Design a protein around this ligand. Structure first.
Ligand SMILES: N[C@@H](CC1=CCCCc2onc(O)c21)C(=O)O
Ligand SMILES: N[C@@H](CC1=CCCCc2onc(O)c21)C(=O)O
Lengths: 262, 262
């Protein structure tokens, strides 16, 4: 049939997608800015479709409830046919790959440790061997799931620690984890994806830092419903954008050109 | 029909696939060792197939001849139905993606600069602004193609330089590029994928090093003929192996545990 506007599901997560200050004076896609807004425009240009950015109803990335078997977040929007594509910092995982399609990575990343500057921690092993400095993750998402599923000895011990720590070491949002780091006088470390750690490191008041190597290696992908006809074009678009250096340009723009820490 | 042995095409490229010293006293897959041999065994175990490692006829990764339109190397073996899967340090590129299927990356990497220790070069920009130190790439493969296709100003200038340099700055094999670096008294730098640069850096006589950041960001994938029924299982296997930390274990085994430079 006739072409339709492609419904893009995304999430408000700086610097990937933010509402512009002057959003009330703008309409539609122009209300938003960020790395994923720019990426969505580049993909659309290359694939020759028109699209509407929509924010995921429940503010979640995507996980399957263990009892009800229902997928939430952006994954759920794709699975249940509420959106045609997800363009977001959405991690390619095994469990998600089984239910939706993903492009090859548009960004490479790993779980990493955020500390308040001066915190005497250099590695995950360091965290795992102590409890003076509390540490946690988002209360949902691929980072939490990594620890929950991990059989690697250090990570398995960290998960048992995080699951049992009081008060709770889990945070509802990246902003909440960052503010907890900044407010805890070195007694909370935050486990989050390296690209987000890197972004925060260039934000005022420049009091956090990424420490140690990454715990794992993975990527974000553009996601579509399994079998979607859009999947192919979009994947080739990501590959072309990467090869042309445009993804590297988008990262520099949102991380470093706009950096507040010198 | 009845299950058949899966024909795996691969390439002799240390440390991914090497003939064992005592190969004449062994049979079949046991003749070979390396990161990709170990990876192939893990994939096969997870996917429940039997397989035969075979070395690509022409010793090439895969490129399309501009006139004849014929694909060579491992890509060609897949395209023309001579092999069922390629398990090798085979880069996911746009042009290859259009003709074969790839898993999500099993290794992340970027083009990088190899120098003889002491060479006064720190970056691609440094190379591009001079000619005293010659520099080149493999005479075929994704690194050569990156420069040939690139419109990024520094890389475009490097390509014109490499295409016009005399004597030729192109090498037929990684071993040839490495030996040229080691034999040129600091007057040749070699552009090659970062993981190979890293591997050589841990080999005697420990006289090379990787310098500067990577020029790009990409990944190696397991490749199958477009539409192959094997593609799905194999992709989920790579994702599982990554999440379990087994890919990181394989890299440590072949790069660092076996390292000769301390
Ligand atoms: N990429 C994660 C979610 C996430 C989003 C914001 C960036 C940092 C981060 O760190 N751990 C996570 O789970 C996250 C996912 O796809 O579940
Ligand atoms: N991965 C490359 C080929 C290649 C193989 C050996 C490792 C280092 C390397 O550096 N530049 C290349 O093209 C290579 C390809 O898929 O074309």
């Amino acid at each position: 049939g006739a072409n339709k506007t492609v419904v893009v599901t995304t999430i408000l997560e700086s610097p990937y997608v933010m509402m512009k200050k002057n959003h009330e004076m703008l309409e539609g896609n122009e209300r938003y800015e960020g790395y994923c807004v720019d990426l969505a425009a580049e993909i659309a240009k290359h694939c020759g479709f028109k699209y509407k950015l929509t924010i995921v109803g429940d503010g979640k990335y995507g996980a399957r409830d263990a009892d009800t078997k229902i997928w939430n977040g952006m994954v759920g929007e794709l699975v249940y046919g509420k959106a045609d594509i997800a363009i977001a910092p959405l991690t390619i995982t095994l469990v998600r790959e089984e239910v939706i399609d993903f492009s090859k990575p548009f960004m490479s990343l790993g779980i990493s440790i955020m500390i308040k500057k001066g915190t005497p921690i250099e590695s995950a092993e360091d965290l795992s061997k102590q409890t003076e400095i509390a540490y946690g993750t988002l209360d949902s998402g691929s980072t939490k799931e990594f620890f929950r599923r991990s059989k690697i000895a250090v990570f398995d011990k960290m998960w048992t620690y995080m699951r049992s720590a009081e008060p709770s070491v889990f945070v509802r949002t990246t902003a909440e984890g960052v503010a907890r780091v900044r407010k805890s006088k070195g007694k909370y470390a935050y486990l989050l994806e390296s690209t987000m750690n890197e972004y925060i490191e260039q934000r005022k008041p420049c009091d956090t830092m990424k420490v140690g190597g990454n715990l794992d290696s993975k990527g974000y992908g553009i996601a579509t419903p399994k079998g979607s006809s859009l999947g192919n074009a979009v994947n080739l678009a990501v590959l072309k954008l990467n090869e042309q250096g445009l993804l590297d340009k988008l990262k520099n723009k949102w991380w470093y050109d706009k950096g507040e820490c010198g």
